[PDB]
Design a protein around this ligand. Sequence first.
Ligand SMILES: CO[C@@H]1O[C@@H]2CO[C@](C)(C(=O)O)O[C@H]2[C@H](O[C@@H]2O[C@H](CO)[C@@H](O)[C@H](O)[C@H]2NC(C)=O)[C@@H]1NC(C)=O
Length: 164
Amino acid sequence: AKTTQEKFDALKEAGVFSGYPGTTDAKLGQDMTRAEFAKVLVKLFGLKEIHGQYSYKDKNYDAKNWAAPFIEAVTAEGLMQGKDLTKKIFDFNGKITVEEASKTLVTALKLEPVKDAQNKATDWAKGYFEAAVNAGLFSKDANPKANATRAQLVEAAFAADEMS
Ligand SMILES: CO[C@@H]1O[C@@H]2CO[C@](C)(C(=O)O)O[C@H]2[C@H](O[C@@H]2O[C@H](CO)[C@@H](O)[C@H](O)[C@H]2NC(C)=O)[C@@H]1NC(C)=O
């Protein structure tokens, strides 16, 4: 079985994840913004980027924001809808959590949420986290509410790619 690092290298060659300048360190212990994760989802699932459209009101969510085409693409695909509908806030600088990642991947893979699922996830997410655990995207001992580490995102993305 491939290590996290070998899984990363594969995803990177494929354009789905990136490294950092001037180092081979993949920084598997660090976190990831929701903007970057939207981009991961686009590259992982082969989605079309949507230019010149803005469905959120966050400060600096505009045409100069490199993430908008990715954010719009995952929004149009129904994978993500942001954090509150009435102010139209996506939170692109906020970090992706393991339960949030679970929802997007389970949805994209067309897997079904677990009903009556019992776990430590926020109420809205319990079914998606559990489904994700069952499909081997995250380990059952991951904290649904924590920022997902890049290592966790790599293992999820890799597993997701294998399933798709
Ligand atoms: C703090 O609120 C959450 O923010 C999450 C941010 O990340 C995602 C994956 C996103 O879409 O960007 O999920 C957001 C949460 O959205 C909730 O997603 C559920 C999963 O499908 C939906 O069933 C719920 O309708 C949605 N809202 C609530 C209140 O649970 C939920 N957002 C909202 C608007 O309720």
